Design a protein around this ligand. Sequence first.
Ligand SMILES: OC[C@H]1O[C@@H]2O[C@H]3[C@H](O)[C@@H](O)[C@@H](O[C@H]4[C@H](O)[C@@H](O)[C@@H](O[C@H]5[C@H](O)[C@@H](O)[C@@H](O[C@H]6[C@H](O)[C@@H](O)[C@@H](O[C@H]7[C@H](O)[C@@H](O)[C@@H](O[C@H]8[C@H](O)[C@@H](O)[C@@H](O[C@H]1[C@H](O)[C@H]2O)O[C@@H]8CO)O[C@@H]7CO)O[C@@H]6CO)O[C@@H]5CO)O[C@@H]4CO)O[C@@H]3CO
Length: 129
Amino acid sequence: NLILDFPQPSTDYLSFRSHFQKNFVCLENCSLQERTVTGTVKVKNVSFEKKVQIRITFDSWKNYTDVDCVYMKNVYGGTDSDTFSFAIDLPPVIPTEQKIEFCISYHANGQVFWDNNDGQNYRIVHVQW
Ligand SMILES: OC[C@H]1O[C@@H]2O[C@H]3[C@H](O)[C@@H](O)[C@@H](O[C@H]4[C@H](O)[C@@H](O)[C@@H](O[C@H]5[C@H](O)[C@@H](O)[C@@H](O[C@H]6[C@H](O)[C@@H](O)[C@@H](O[C@H]7[C@H](O)[C@@H](O)[C@@H](O[C@H]8[C@H](O)[C@@H](O)[C@@H](O[C@H]1[C@H](O)[C@H]2O)O[C@@H]8CO)O[C@@H]7CO)O[C@@H]6CO)O[C@@H]5CO)O[C@@H]4CO)O[C@@H]3CO
């Protein structure tokens, strides 16, 4: 009934790297299971202290929620970037007319960086299936 309306950003490496180098934050993977959306976010390692959040709407941006992401230790990651994970429960019912979208914010060293997917956000759409 719901599906991701975007390719996994990490699949197209050249696009992923271009966005990540420009914005210093980029969604890496995302999956929709049951009524929960989970995923991973790559951020440039700008400073020790970081705050990474998903800003998500389930009602066409009438409202939104900021959800904290959690740092993921990665033995195989480099020292230039860090990985954060998120898990967000969907509301029990979302009417078909309502848009579901999210974007990502990243605070470090007094600055804020955004992944808004080239101004479209990351969309989840309603389907017949
Ligand atoms: O321990 C040395 C450290 O002490 C002081 O730091 C204090 C700090 O100022 C307070 O803010 C508080 O910190 C808490 C913090 O506010 C919370 O947000 C949370 O921290 C989380 C981070 O926000 C989050 O980003 C993630 O952290 C991981 C990093 O993302 C990842 O990159 C890696 O971190 C490495 C750093 O990137 C790298 O720079 C290097 O860090 C050194 C610092 O650069 C250097 O300044 C100093 O740090 C001092 C600091 O200046 C003091 O203010 O030494 C660091 C090396 O020891 O190395 C890092 C890897 O070791 O990994 C981290 C995760 O380890 O997740 C964390 C949540 O775990 O919690 C913080 C409290 O735990 O208190 C601190 C502690 O005194």
